[PDB]
Amino acid sequence: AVSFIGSTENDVGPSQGSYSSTHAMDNLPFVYNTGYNIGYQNANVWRISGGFCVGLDGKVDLPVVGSLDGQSIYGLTEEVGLLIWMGDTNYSRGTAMSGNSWENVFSGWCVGNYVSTQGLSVHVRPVILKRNSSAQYSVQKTSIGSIRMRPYNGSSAGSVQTTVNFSLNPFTLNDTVT
Numbered sequence: 001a002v003s004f005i006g007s008t009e010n011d012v013g014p015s016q017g018s019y020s021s022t023h024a025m026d027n028l029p030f031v032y033n034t035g036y037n038i039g040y041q042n043a044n045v046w047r048i049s050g051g052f053c054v055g056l057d058g059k060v061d062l063p064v065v066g067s068l069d070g071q072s073i074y075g076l077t078e079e080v081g082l083l084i085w086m087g088d089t090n091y092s093r094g095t096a097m098s099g100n101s102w103e104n105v106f107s108g109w110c111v112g113n114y115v116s117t118q119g120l121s122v123h124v125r126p127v128i129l130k131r132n133s134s135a136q137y138s139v140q141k142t143s144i145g146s147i148r149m150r151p152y153n154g155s156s157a158g159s160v161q162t163t164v165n166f167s168l169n170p171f172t173l174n175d176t177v178t
């Protein structure tokens with residue numbers, strides 16, 4: 001069996017956080033080293049039991065404005081982009097996102113004759129896109145995409161909520177250019 005125990009709408013990163021970085025103007029696109037700080041994580045989004053098998057698919061709705069090392073650079077503003085990862089609970093298990101389609105972000109696992117849970121995580125990193133002198137960039141609260149649980153091996157979601165959404169909290173980038 002499966003049931004939904006998380007939240008439908010989830011914020012990514014601290015609200016109106018400020019991030020500073022320094023980069024050479026010739027080093028673009030530039031990814032801010034924010035670690036897993038601009039993210040969301042919850043080990044308990046679905047409760048599963050009795051042989052239920054489940055994985056996760058992720059979808060980013062932001063426009064693809066570029067590509068970096070095999071993953072999409074999603075657009076926020078003309079000057080700021082975003083790299084995105086979605087996956088199982090541990091941030092380290094995040095899957096690099098590309099495109100705007102539902103992608104497998106967690107191969108899945110099957111619970112046995114007991115009850116457990118299925119979680120998820122999302123983290124992103126800001127990207128400076130255009131050459132410019134030192135400047136401050138502001139990013140508005142913006143919807144990013146979603147993550148859906150995906151039953152397999154004959155398991156079924158039935159009427160259970162399968163999808164949750166993620167909204168990027170506003171932030172400011174204090175960009176120093178050398």
Ligand SMILES: CC(=O)N[C@@H]1[C@@H](O)[C@H](O)[C@@H](CO)O[C@H]1O
Nearest residue numbers: 043044088089116117118119120
């Ligand atoms: C409470 C807890 O840790 N539950 C985790 C869940 O978050 C994760 O999605 C799943 C698959 O790795 O393993 C469970 O044990």
Ligand SMILES: CC(=O)N[C@@H]1[C@@H](O)[C@H](O)[C@@H](CO)O[C@H]1O
Nearest residue numbers: 056057058101102103104105150
């Ligand atoms: C278009 C679409 O829904 N893509 C799904 C993908 O999410 C899923 O991970 C994969 C196998 O699990 O099967 C594809 O059909």
